[PDB]
Amino acid sequence: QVVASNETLYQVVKEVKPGGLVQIADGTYKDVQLIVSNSGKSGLPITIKALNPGKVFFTGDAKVELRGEHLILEGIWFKDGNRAIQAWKSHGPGLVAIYGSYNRITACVFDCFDEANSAYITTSLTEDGKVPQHCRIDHCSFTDKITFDQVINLNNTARAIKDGSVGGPAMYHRVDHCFFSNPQKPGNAGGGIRIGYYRNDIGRCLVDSNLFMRQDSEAEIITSKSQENVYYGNTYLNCQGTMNFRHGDHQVAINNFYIGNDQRFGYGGMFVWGSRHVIACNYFELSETIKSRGNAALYLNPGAMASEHALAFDMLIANNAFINVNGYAIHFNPLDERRKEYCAANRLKFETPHQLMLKGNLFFKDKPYVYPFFKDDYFIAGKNSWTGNVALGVEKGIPVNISANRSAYKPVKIKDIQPIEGIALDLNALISKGITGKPLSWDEVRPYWLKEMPGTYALTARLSADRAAKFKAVIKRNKEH
Numbered sequence: 001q002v003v004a005s006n007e008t009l010y011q012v013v014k015e016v017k018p019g020g021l022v023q024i025a026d027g028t029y030k031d032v033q034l035i036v037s038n039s040g041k042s043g044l045p046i047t048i049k050a051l052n053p054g055k056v057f058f059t060g061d062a063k064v065e066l067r068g069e070h071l072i073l074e075g076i077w078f079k080d081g082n083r084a085i086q087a088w089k090s091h092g093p094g095l096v097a098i099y100g101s102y103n104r105i106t107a108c109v110f111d112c113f114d115e116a117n118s119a120y121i122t123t124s125l126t127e128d129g130k131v132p133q134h135c136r137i138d139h140c141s142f143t144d145k146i147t148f149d150q151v152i153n154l155n156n157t158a159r160a161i162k163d164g165s166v167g168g169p170a171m172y173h174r175v176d177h178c179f180f181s182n183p184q185k186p187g188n189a190g191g192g193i194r195i196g197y198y199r200n201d202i203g204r205c206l207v208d209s210n211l212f213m214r215q216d217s218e219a220e221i222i223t224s225k226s227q228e229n230v231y232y233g234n235t236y237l238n239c240q241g242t243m244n245f246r247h248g249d250h251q252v253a254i255n256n257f258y259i260g261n262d263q264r265f266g267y268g269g270m271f272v273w274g275s276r277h278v279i280a281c282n283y284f285e286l287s288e289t290i291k292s293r294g295n296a297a298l299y300l301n302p303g304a305m306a307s308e309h310a311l312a313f314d315m316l317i318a319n320n321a322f323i324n325v326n327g328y329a330i331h332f333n334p335l336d337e338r339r340k341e342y343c344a345a346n347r348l349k350f351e352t353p354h355q356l357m358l359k360g361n362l363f364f365k366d367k368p369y370v371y372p373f374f375k376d377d378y379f380i381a382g383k384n385s386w387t388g389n390v391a392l393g394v395e396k397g398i399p400v401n402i403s404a405n406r407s408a409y410k411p412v413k414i415k416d417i418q419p420i421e422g423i424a425l426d427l428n429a430l431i432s433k434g435i436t437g438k439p440l441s442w443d444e445v446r447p448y449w450l451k452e453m454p455g456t457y458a459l460t461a462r463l464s465a466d467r468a469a470k471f472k473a474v475i476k477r478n479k480e481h
């Protein structure tokens with residue numbers, strides 16, 4: 001039914017049956033506490049949407065909880081929030097918290113909501129430990145987040161100082177066609193998306209066709225902290241950070257675009273920890289790279305095997321293209337001094353990247369940047385395997401013989417890569433095709449009903465005066481008195 005007030009919405013949501021449709025009349029729903037515990041069924045979801053997307057606003061001290069299964073939340077604009085700062089925490093439920101499986105949040109706008117620290121959307125475990133699976137977050141816009149924690153957290157374990165061989169279960173969520181543009185916070189402040197927490201966690205989440213444009217929240221654009229997540233066809237434009245395989249072996253990144261097109265800040269880029277990954281057909285063209293990380297497009301982590309800062313080794317880096325990167329194309333030992341400290345403290349064995357299969361990559365430069373293509377201060381003949389790559393435009397920086405014949409360049413055919421269970425993508429086919437398409441634009445991911453890109457940061461790298469004042473207050477209360 002159509003509802004026009006918080007009270008009537010609360011009532012209809014308690015009565016709605018599978019296949020039901022709840023439509024919210026044009027208006028502002030201030031301090032709305034939407035809790036949906038009922039469930040739809042496969043083929044008969046329950047849909048809660050704005051009757052006219054773009055005309056419904058959830059504001060004030062609001063909260064949405066999707067506890068039932070087979071629910072769809074659509075066309076809501078979240079703004080002008082006012083949740084209690086003493087009542088929300090990073091690592092807790094998001095403004096929208098998804099506790100049930102088979103749920104979808106689509107075509108929603110989250111714009112500088114408020115000053116309470118938390119994610120904008122989370123999949124969250126219920127108190128009895130049940131983990132939501134098979135959810136989808138798509139065609140949503142997340143802009144000007146001025147609070148700590150990631151924009152989205154996909155959880156399969158409760159936060160804990162951890163380290164027991166037990167890990168969270170596979171989630172099988174998908175985050176697609178979302179837009180992310182958010183300002184830089186200080187320190188380990190929470191980035192764009194976090195999936196899982198530690199290496200024993202299994203993710204199997206698909207993150208595809210998203211546009212991160214000045215997603216600058218913190219060092220990590222995405223901190224992928226679980227095994228077997230697949231990142232396909234995402235565009236990272238002028239982002240002050242790197243997309244990371246932080247924890248969890250056997251992760252996949254195929255055909256993503258990492259573009260930096262001005263000199264305003266250092267951009268990224270990928271920082272990789274762990275082994276057995278598949279990093280293929282990605283395109284890196286970065287006008288400026290990140291000094292603090294080591295000035296590179298692809299950073300391969302040195303350290304102790306399978307540790308808290310797991311050594312990057314035994315993986316396939318294929319058919320990628322590094323075009324005019326103003327930094328190293330690949331840095332084989334970033335932050336090595338800190339990693340030696342971590343290894344010494346825990347009495348672990350410090351090692352450097354090896355057993356890498358670098359096949360069919362193109363390294364090209366025709367702009368006056370000064371960086372050789374590679375940095376490997378621990379180079380050892382034969383530790384890595386290089387085949388079918390092409391390098392031209394600047395010295396390589398390491399003693400490896402690579403063809404300089406650009407005209408003869410061709411991505412390599414690969415057919416031995418196992419697909420990820422639960423994710424319908426033919427990795428062999430995609431990798432063998434080489435790099436397809438081009439960077440995604442706002443019109444390719446925007447909510448169907450929204451023409452104008454929201455936010456003040458994406459196009460300017462600066463929050464408007466009002467939002468900057470609120471951001472300043474959030475930052476100040478989170479630090480030392």
Ligand SMILES: *[C@H]1O[C@H](CO)[C@@H](O[C@@H]2O[C@@H](C)[C@H](O)[C@@H](O)[C@H]2O)[C@H](O)[C@@H]1O[C@H]1O[C@H](C(=O)O)[C@@H](O[C@@H]2OC[C@@H](O[C@@H]3O[C@@H](C)[C@@H](O[C@@H]4O[C@H](CO)[C@@H](O)[C@H](O)[C@H]4O)[C@@H](O[C@H]4O[C@H](CO)[C@H](O)[C@H](O)[C@H]4O)[C@@H]3OC)[C@H](O)[C@H]2O)[C@H](O)[C@H]1O
Pocket residue numbers: 176177208209232233234255436437438439440444445
């Ligand atoms: C993420 O998305 C981006 C694009 O936004 C992709 O970007 C490309 O790749 C990047 C690497 C590059 O950077 C970029 O530049 C691009 O090159 C990126 O790869 C990712 O792709 C994934 O997401 C896509 C997305 O969601 O946009 C996926 O594409 C969709 O795939 C499904 C397609 O649907 C099928 O085709 C449509 C037209 C329907 O079929 C037609 O149905 C008509 C009516 O029945 C019929 O008359 C016609 O004969 C059919 O052809 C659809 O059918 C289904 O729906 C219809 C109703 O519309 C009926 O109900 C049917 O019963 C039902 O089956 C088809 O389903 C197979 C969709 O069009 C397409 O957009 C992509 O596959 C992902 O990999």
Ligand SMILES: CC(=O)N[C@@H]1[C@@H](O[C@@H]2O[C@H](C(=O)O)[C@@H](O[C@@H]3O[C@H](CO)[C@H](OS(=O)(=O)O)[C@H](O[C@@H]4OC(C(=O)O)=C[C@H](O)[C@H]4O)[C@H]3NC(C)=O)[C@H](O)[C@H]2O)[C@@H](OS(=O)(=O)O)[C@@H](CO)O[C@H]1O
Pocket residue numbers: 186187188219220292335338
């Ligand atoms: C516990 C843990 O390992 N967590 C990791 C997390 O590691 C943390 O990374 C930060 C970082 O932002 O790099 C790091 O803090 C930085 O440490 C350096 C020294 O190594 C500087 O500290 S200082 O020596 O006291 O100055 C640095 O400060 C910056 O110094 C300089 C300069 O002189 O170059 C200029 C700057 O103005 C000043 O800010 C400091 N940065 C900050 C913001 O304080 C922590 O020590 C480190 O624990 C990350 O992993 S890692 O790969 O970056 O090492 C994170 C992934 O991004 O993952 C967590 O698990």
